[PDB]
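[SOLVED] Need 3D model of a seven-part complex

Original post:
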Amino acid sequence: AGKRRVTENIGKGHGMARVERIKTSPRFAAFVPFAVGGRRTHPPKVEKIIW
Amino acid sequence: KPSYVKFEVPQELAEKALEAVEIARDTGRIRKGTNETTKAVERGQAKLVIIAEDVDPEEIVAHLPPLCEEKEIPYVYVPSKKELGAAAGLEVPAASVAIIEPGKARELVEDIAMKVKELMK
Amino acid sequence: SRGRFSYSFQNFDPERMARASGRDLRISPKHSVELLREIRGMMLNDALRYLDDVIAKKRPVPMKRFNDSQGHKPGKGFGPGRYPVKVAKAVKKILLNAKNNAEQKGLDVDRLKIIHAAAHRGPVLRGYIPRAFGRATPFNEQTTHIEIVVEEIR
Amino acid sequence: NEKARLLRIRAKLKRKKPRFLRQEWWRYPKFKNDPKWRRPKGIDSKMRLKKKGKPRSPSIGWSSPKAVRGLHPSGYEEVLVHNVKELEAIDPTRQAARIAGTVGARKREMILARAKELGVKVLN
Amino acid sequence: MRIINAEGLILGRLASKVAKMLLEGEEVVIVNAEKAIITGNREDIFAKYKQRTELRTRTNPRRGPFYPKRSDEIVRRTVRGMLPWKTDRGRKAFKRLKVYVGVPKEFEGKEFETISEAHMSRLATPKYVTVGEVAKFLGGKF
RNA sequence: CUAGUACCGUGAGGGAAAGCUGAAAAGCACCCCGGGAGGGGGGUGAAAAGAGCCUGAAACCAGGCGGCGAUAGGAGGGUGCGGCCCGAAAGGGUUGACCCUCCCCGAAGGAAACACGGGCGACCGUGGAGUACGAGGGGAGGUGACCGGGGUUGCACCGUCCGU
RNA sequence: GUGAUCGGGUAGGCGGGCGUGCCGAUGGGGCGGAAGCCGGGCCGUGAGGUCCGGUGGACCCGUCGGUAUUGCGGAUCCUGCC
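Solution:
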């Protein structure tokens, strides 16, 4: 989850942050933890020991 | 039935005295406070006097009745400190009051007086 | 009726007053604000004469708040001024509606006075203009609400 | 008496005590509409350095005397009450009652009547 | 209003006293401003005041400085120097003062104070000049 | 939710946004103005909650009220003393607000007038006197209704933003 | 009880408290009006808590013990509005 989009960074020297964005309009940010719709940084995992 | 009381009032001259105080404050000059009415009836400035029925402790106005009795001043009862002080014109309660230069309510005031004479004797 | 909107006016008395509104108008809110300032406090007949003179361009309107690059005008107190014709027309229609409403209420149309005149910004209608180097930028219409209350003078 | 004296002390101290607010609470609406204290942590901060002309920071000296800490200005210890069964186990001599805000009118009336019987001061 | 005759008084000491009076709250009038004295050598004194007069903002001469050429205004300006001119208190104090050359008709035959701690018999050395001399060298109509 | 949909790319391929009337449509009959969208009176409903529909924050904008407002200098604040205005009673208060006078105890600290003397003098020593005062801790009588708070602002002293 | 021989603090170590969502228990509130929102009071060094009035129309809190996608001013941060 959050790991499905295909992204590209445009890099430096453009007045904007270096942030992975999708390639087709509307060119919204994707995949990274702090983006809306992105992967969640440290999510609950089924391998955790409860017993 | 508190202890330092000696009388009973019907609602009729109760509310009559209500209006009497209200319009006395409005028209002439009057005096609200336990020490105040003590001093009124001491110096002999007291035309009519009122005490409250919600007075804790019973030490605060116990003497007013006898000292008025002695100097021959009329003194009546009223139920609520709240209404008492309100008609006295205050955001606060009040325990005993006295009237002076009473205009516009001689009828009412000495009528209360005669009714309390009858209740007394 | 159909009170979709309300008024900023407080203390409305229906025995003495009448109301009128214009909603979602495609006019400038800045010019609306400047012009309603000038009629606040007048009698309706005088205000209608003033509006007709503005529409004919015989009397300018002072520009006290929104006045960038604006020329001055003949006479005393100028200073920057304009002639906003579209806004004056729309306001004329609002005022005539108010007069009708007062007269079907039963008030005297020669003793009416404007005691409330205010313009509010309405919703924006969004558009776009093509530019150079592959850009399209915004090209938008700003809308206006206007409300008026008149009172009868004893 | 000692308690009256310490209540006086508390009153004076808490009249002199300032309202403790973060560095620039007056400059941005994001801080005006939620006013709180936060510790300044910046290397170059004047309120951290405690320099003259700059607002003050909270410290353990501003605390009130233990005997009177947390008391109502009347002088009583408050107890929240949600029903009449909580009224008893109040000591009318040093405790007073505050009725909870979510209690309905039906019970407000009952609680006030029972408090009048027992002689318990109700602060609201 | 206290009226002070400046005849034979040392300018700076006079000004110090007057500034203190104006700050304490009194109205003051100085007469015979041209007859106050300045001690020292004429060349150094005149050079100082001429240098004062040739000071101006290079980009706009309507922004000053505006150091004086007349005698009454020299005296006024010295007093101003001894006050807190940048505050409202100082501005009000400075408005409570007036200085005059000679004695105008309105003050004739009246009580003229004198400030004892300013007086030139106090002096020993005779190297001194007069404020009127300075004004004349600078080009003032008195 | 009419989503691998609309849409973009010659093509492999890339890829959104978008939930809530009310118990019931009972979803505004009728009159005046307006070219019209609509406005105003009237109606339904417990409530307009009116489909531009539960609640309806902030930023932003308009008007009304209050205070300031055209001789004036500092990162927009801090301390202290004042002016104009507003009040709830959840804080207090006639079961006594504020203020005025008198009696008692009083830490560290600590006067002056005055009598004599020393010093060229600025001053000092002795006694007055550890007195009169003095943070504060108690008492007694005169008075009779505000106080605390809040908004804005004047005067004086202080103050070169935040993160790195 | 003792402290003339305790009272500044960056990196950094240690101690105690405030706040948020769900569970096992326990005590409770709510159409005689819950949560949320606006404006004001009191307590608290403080993080914060609680009351009054208004708006709203259906759920919520305290204590004991557990659990966690648990606290933002900043990333030429992300989305939306101005």
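Edit: Chains A and D do not touch (no CB pair under 8 Å).
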